[PDB]
PDB file of C-alpha atoms in Angstrom:
ATOM      1  CA  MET I   1      97.798  59.486 117.104  1.00  0.00           C
ATOM      2  CA  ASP I   2      96.842  60.340 121.244  1.00  0.00           C
ATOM      3  CA  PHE I   3     100.491  59.932 122.275  1.00  0.00           C
ATOM      4  CA  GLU I   4     102.333  61.643 118.894  1.00  0.00           C
ATOM      5  CA  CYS I   5     105.193  63.495 121.535  1.00  0.00           C
ATOM      6  CA  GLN I   6     106.035  66.676 120.261  1.00  0.00           C
ATOM      7  CA  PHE I   7     107.089  69.436 122.078  1.00  0.00           C
ATOM      8  CA  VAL I   8     106.443  70.500 125.793  1.00  0.00           C
ATOM      9  CA  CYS I   9     103.026  72.387 126.085  1.00  0.00           C
ATOM     10  CA  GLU I  10     101.767  73.984 129.376  1.00  0.00           C
ATOM     11  CA  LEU I  11      98.217  74.615 130.613  1.00  0.00           C
ATOM     12  CA  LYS I  12      98.826  78.223 131.191  1.00  0.00           C
ATOM     13  CA  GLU I  13      96.710  80.890 132.885  1.00  0.00           C
ATOM     14  CA  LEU I  14      96.905  84.786 131.359  1.00  0.00           C
ATOM     15  CA  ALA I  15      97.106  87.618 133.629  1.00  0.00           C
ATOM     16  CA  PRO I  16      95.516  90.676 134.015  1.00  0.00           C
ATOM     17  CA  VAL I  17      97.099  93.466 132.941  1.00  0.00           C
ATOM     18  CA  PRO I  18      96.532  96.991 132.265  1.00  0.00           C
ATOM     19  CA  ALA I  19      97.128  97.180 128.594  1.00  0.00           C
ATOM     20  CA  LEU I  20      96.220  99.582 125.555  1.00  0.00           C
ATOM     21  CA  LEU I  21      95.656  97.915 122.104  1.00  0.00           C
ATOM     22  CA  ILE I  22      93.752  98.859 118.862  1.00  0.00           C
ATOM     23  CA  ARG I  23      91.435  96.270 118.210  1.00  0.00           C
ATOM     24  CA  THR I  24      91.478  95.663 114.592  1.00  0.00           C
ATOM     25  CA  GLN I  25      89.943  92.941 112.412  1.00  0.00           C
ATOM     26  CA  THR I  26      92.698  91.881 109.615  1.00  0.00           C
ATOM     27  CA  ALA I  27      93.832  89.119 107.196  1.00  0.00           C
ATOM     28  CA  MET I  28      96.810  86.586 107.817  1.00  0.00           C
ATOM     29  CA  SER I  29      98.269  88.541 104.694  1.00  0.00           C
ATOM     30  CA  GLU I  30      98.073  91.675 106.453  1.00  0.00           C
ATOM     31  CA  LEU I  31      98.912  90.402 109.824  1.00  0.00           C
ATOM     32  CA  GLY I  32     102.918  90.590 109.120  1.00  0.00           C
ATOM     33  CA  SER I  33     102.810  94.187 108.129  1.00  0.00           C
ATOM     34  CA  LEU I  34     100.218  95.604 110.340  1.00  0.00           C
ATOM     35  CA  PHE I  35     102.596  94.273 113.566  1.00  0.00           C
ATOM     36  CA  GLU I  36     105.474  95.728 111.890  1.00  0.00           C
ATOM     37  CA  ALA I  37     103.859  99.175 112.022  1.00  0.00           C
ATOM     38  CA  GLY I  38     102.433  98.754 114.764  1.00  0.00           C
ATOM     39  CA  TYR I  39     104.612  98.191 117.040  1.00  0.00           C
ATOM     40  CA  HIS I  40     106.981 101.201 115.511  1.00  0.00           C
ATOM     41  CA  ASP I  41     104.588 103.748 115.589  1.00  0.00           C
ATOM     42  CA  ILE I  42     102.252 103.278 118.467  1.00  0.00           C
ATOM     43  CA  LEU I  43     100.085 106.032 120.022  1.00  0.00           C
ATOM     44  CA  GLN I  44     101.048 109.567 120.198  1.00  0.00           C
ATOM     45  CA  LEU I  45      99.399 109.431 123.550  1.00  0.00           C
ATOM     46  CA  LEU I  46     101.955 106.932 124.843  1.00  0.00           C
ATOM     47  CA  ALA I  47     104.813 108.059 122.679  1.00  0.00           C
ATOM     48  CA  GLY I  48     103.980 111.754 123.446  1.00  0.00           C
ATOM     49  CA  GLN I  49     103.270 111.407 127.368  1.00  0.00           C
ATOM     50  CA  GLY I  50     107.178 110.751 128.126  1.00  0.00           C
ATOM     51  CA  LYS I  51     106.257 107.532 128.809  1.00  0.00           C
ATOM     52  CA  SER I  52     107.108 103.400 128.101  1.00  0.00           C
ATOM     53  CA  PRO I  53     105.601  99.938 128.174  1.00  0.00           C
ATOM     54  CA  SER I  54     106.213  98.054 131.531  1.00  0.00           C
ATOM     55  CA  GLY I  55     106.901  94.803 129.269  1.00  0.00           C
ATOM     56  CA  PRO I  56     107.254  93.557 126.018  1.00  0.00           C
ATOM     57  CA  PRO I  57     104.501  93.615 123.274  1.00  0.00           C
ATOM     58  CA  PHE I  58     101.852  90.757 123.213  1.00  0.00           C
ATOM     59  CA  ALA I  59      99.522  90.339 120.234  1.00  0.00           C
ATOM     60  CA  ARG I  60      96.298  88.817 121.030  1.00  0.00           C
ATOM     61  CA  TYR I  61      93.716  88.001 118.056  1.00  0.00           C
ATOM     62  CA  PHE I  62      90.129  86.879 118.503  1.00  0.00           C
ATOM     63  CA  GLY I  63      88.255  84.851 116.353  1.00  0.00           C
ATOM     64  CA  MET I  64      88.744  80.840 115.498  1.00  0.00           C
ATOM     65  CA  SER I  65      90.646  80.262 112.115  1.00  0.00           C
ATOM     66  CA  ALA I  66      88.834  82.222 109.629  1.00  0.00           C
ATOM     67  CA  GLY I  67      89.273  84.920 106.347  1.00  0.00           C
ATOM     68  CA  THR I  68      89.716  88.075 108.461  1.00  0.00           C
ATOM     69  CA  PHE I  69      89.914  87.731 112.477  1.00  0.00           C
ATOM     70  CA  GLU I  70      90.433  90.477 115.128  1.00  0.00           C
ATOM     71  CA  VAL I  71      93.814  91.458 116.550  1.00  0.00           C
ATOM     72  CA  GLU I  72      94.841  93.547 119.152  1.00  0.00           C
ATOM     73  CA  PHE I  73      98.286  94.600 119.768  1.00  0.00           C
ATOM     74  CA  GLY I  74      98.243  94.909 123.734  1.00  0.00           C
ATOM     75  CA  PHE I  75     100.445  96.822 125.100  1.00  0.00           C
ATOM     76  CA  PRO I  76     101.859  96.661 128.354  1.00  0.00           C
ATOM     77  CA  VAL I  77     101.219  99.834 130.596  1.00  0.00           C
ATOM     78  CA  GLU I  78     101.284 100.857 134.292  1.00  0.00           C
ATOM     79  CA  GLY I  79      97.539 102.036 134.356  1.00  0.00           C
ATOM     80  CA  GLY I  80      97.992 105.842 134.103  1.00  0.00           C
ATOM     81  CA  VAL I  81      97.717 106.198 130.430  1.00  0.00           C
ATOM     82  CA  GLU I  82      95.140 106.727 127.973  1.00  0.00           C
ATOM     83  CA  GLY I  83      94.284 106.241 124.177  1.00  0.00           C
ATOM     84  CA  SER I  84      92.309 107.857 121.267  1.00  0.00           C
ATOM     85  CA  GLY I  85      90.547 106.263 117.986  1.00  0.00           C
ATOM     86  CA  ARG I  86      90.737 103.072 117.882  1.00  0.00           C
ATOM     87  CA  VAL I  87      93.770 102.383 120.045  1.00  0.00           C
ATOM     88  CA  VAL I  88      92.774 102.363 123.505  1.00  0.00           C
ATOM     89  CA  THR I  89      93.675 101.754 127.418  1.00  0.00           C
ATOM     90  CA  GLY I  90      91.909  98.566 128.655  1.00  0.00           C
ATOM     91  CA  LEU I  91      92.379  95.510 131.004  1.00  0.00           C
ATOM     92  CA  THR I  92      92.987  91.434 130.155  1.00  0.00           C
ATOM     93  CA  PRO I  93      90.957  89.048 132.170  1.00  0.00           C
ATOM     94  CA  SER I  94      92.608  85.990 133.586  1.00  0.00           C
ATOM     95  CA  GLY I  95      91.751  82.148 131.580  1.00  0.00           C
ATOM     96  CA  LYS I  96      93.282  79.276 131.080  1.00  0.00           C
ATOM     97  CA  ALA I  97      94.813  78.458 127.687  1.00  0.00           C
ATOM     98  CA  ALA I  98      97.328  76.244 126.250  1.00  0.00           C
ATOM     99  CA  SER I  99     100.634  78.173 125.728  1.00  0.00           C
ATOM    100  CA  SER I 100     104.159  77.132 125.269  1.00  0.00           C
ATOM    101  CA  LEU I 101     107.563  79.328 124.551  1.00  0.00           C
ATOM    102  CA  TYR I 102     108.947  79.715 121.579  1.00  0.00           C
ATOM    103  CA  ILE I 103     112.718  80.061 122.087  1.00  0.00           C
ATOM    104  CA  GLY I 104     115.186  80.230 119.160  1.00  0.00           C
ATOM    105  CA  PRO I 105     115.065  80.772 115.230  1.00  0.00           C
ATOM    106  CA  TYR I 106     111.841  81.733 113.670  1.00  0.00           C
ATOM    107  CA  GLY I 107     110.112  79.583 110.750  1.00  0.00           C
ATOM    108  CA  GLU I 108     107.122  78.125 110.343  1.00  0.00           C
ATOM    109  CA  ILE I 109     105.108  78.681 113.313  1.00  0.00           C
ATOM    110  CA  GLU I 110     102.145  76.501 112.280  1.00  0.00           C
ATOM    111  CA  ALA I 111     104.438  73.498 113.590  1.00  0.00           C
ATOM    112  CA  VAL I 112     103.946  74.816 117.194  1.00  0.00           C
ATOM    113  CA  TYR I 113     100.059  75.035 116.312  1.00  0.00           C
ATOM    114  CA  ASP I 114      99.860  71.586 115.511  1.00  0.00           C
ATOM    115  CA  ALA I 115     101.627  70.426 118.533  1.00  0.00           C
ATOM    116  CA  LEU I 116      99.302  72.806 121.113  1.00  0.00           C
ATOM    117  CA  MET I 117      96.491  71.653 119.454  1.00  0.00           C
ATOM    118  CA  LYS I 118      97.077  67.868 119.564  1.00  0.00           C
ATOM    119  CA  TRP I 119      97.516  67.709 123.620  1.00  0.00           C
ATOM    120  CA  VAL I 120      94.602  69.753 124.200  1.00  0.00           C
ATOM    121  CA  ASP I 121      92.744  67.267 122.484  1.00  0.00           C
ATOM    122  CA  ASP I 122      93.883  64.442 124.121  1.00  0.00           C
ATOM    123  CA  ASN I 123      93.065  66.567 127.413  1.00  0.00           C
ATOM    124  CA  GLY I 124      89.470  66.827 126.099  1.00  0.00           C
ATOM    125  CA  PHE I 125      89.285  70.500 126.822  1.00  0.00           C
ATOM    126  CA  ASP I 126      87.690  73.126 125.118  1.00  0.00           C
ATOM    127  CA  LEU I 127      88.352  76.727 123.797  1.00  0.00           C
ATOM    128  CA  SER I 128      89.839  79.218 125.852  1.00  0.00           C
ATOM    129  CA  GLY I 129      88.863  82.449 124.355  1.00  0.00           C
ATOM    130  CA  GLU I 130      91.689  83.837 122.189  1.00  0.00           C
ATOM    131  CA  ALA I 131      95.115  83.062 121.063  1.00  0.00           C
ATOM    132  CA  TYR I 132      98.515  85.229 122.211  1.00  0.00           C
ATOM    133  CA  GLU I 133     101.845  86.017 120.589  1.00  0.00           C
ATOM    134  CA  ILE I 134     104.307  88.298 122.210  1.00  0.00           C
ATOM    135  CA  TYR I 135     107.723  89.514 121.323  1.00  0.00           C
ATOM    136  CA  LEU I 136     110.259  89.499 124.169  1.00  0.00           C
ATOM    137  CA  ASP I 137     113.038  91.710 123.579  1.00  0.00           C
ATOM    138  CA  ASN I 138     114.239  92.655 119.579  1.00  0.00           C
ATOM    139  CA  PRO I 139     115.940  89.362 117.492  1.00  0.00           C
ATOM    140  CA  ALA I 140     119.385  88.929 116.488  1.00  0.00           C
ATOM    141  CA  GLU I 141     120.649  91.271 119.120  1.00  0.00           C
ATOM    142  CA  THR I 142     120.727  89.282 121.751  1.00  0.00           C
ATOM    143  CA  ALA I 143     121.154  85.712 120.168  1.00  0.00           C
ATOM    144  CA  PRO I 144     118.608  83.857 118.365  1.00  0.00           C
ATOM    145  CA  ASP I 145     118.460  80.910 120.645  1.00  0.00           C
ATOM    146  CA  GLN I 146     117.068  84.030 123.301  1.00  0.00           C
ATOM    147  CA  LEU I 147     113.925  84.871 121.071  1.00  0.00           C
ATOM    148  CA  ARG I 148     111.405  83.740 123.707  1.00  0.00           C
ATOM    149  CA  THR I 149     107.628  83.740 122.175  1.00  0.00           C
ATOM    150  CA  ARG I 150     104.865  82.315 124.611  1.00  0.00           C
ATOM    151  CA  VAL I 151     102.374  81.246 122.363  1.00  0.00           C
ATOM    152  CA  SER I 152      98.828  80.626 123.363  1.00  0.00           C
ATOM    153  CA  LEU I 153      95.960  79.511 121.117  1.00  0.00           C
ATOM    154  CA  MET I 154      92.362  78.754 121.609  1.00  0.00           C
ATOM    155  CA  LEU I 155      91.998  74.817 122.981  1.00  0.00           C
ATOM    156  CA  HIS I 156      90.509  72.561 120.179  1.00  0.00           C
ATOM    157  CA  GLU I 157      88.339  74.258 117.425  1.00  0.00           C
ATOM    158  CA  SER I 158      90.317  74.118 114.013  1.00  0.00           C
ATOM    159  CA  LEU I 159      93.211  76.465 114.237  1.00  0.00           C
ATOM    160  CA  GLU I 160      93.930  75.296 109.974  1.00  0.00           C
ATOM    161  CA  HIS I 161      97.269  77.889 109.769  1.00  0.00           C
ATOM    162  CA  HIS I 162      99.258  75.843 107.714  1.00  0.00           C
ATOM    163  CA  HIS I 163     102.351  77.109 105.281  1.00  0.00           C
ATOM    164  CA  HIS I 164     103.580  74.118 103.910  1.00  0.00           C
ATOM    165  CA  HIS I 165     107.313  74.182 102.720  1.00  0.00           C
ATOM    166  CA  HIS I 166     107.168  71.507 100.316  1.00  0.00           C
TER     167      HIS I 166
END
């Protein structure tokens, strides 16, 4: 169960980007609906200052596999933006983590978690910090096989998240 060989995982660092986000703790049976509305309606500050994010939204969540974890929507700006309430502007630090770009149609994203869980296990590395998802462009309109999501997760802790279709 060492050399199982599944996908190609890379040790990639996180980049320091000016990003506004709402750090909110939520559950797995909530995260989905949360992101939908969060990407659609994001700050009268941003969408009311007459400007746009300088890149695609990256959803980072802090907290190993648990009932409720702390998520941050993470929208990329240039720096001259302000937040309000719980959705405020911040800065990301750099750090090494296991990341892999999921390019193509979606499904049980748990399958890729298990993959990245395994390679770092063999490596003998430890937790990176928080986990990262990211949505580049809109699905279906630019073909499914061009939907790319560099999914990064914590290194060797638990990450027990499984849908299981059987």
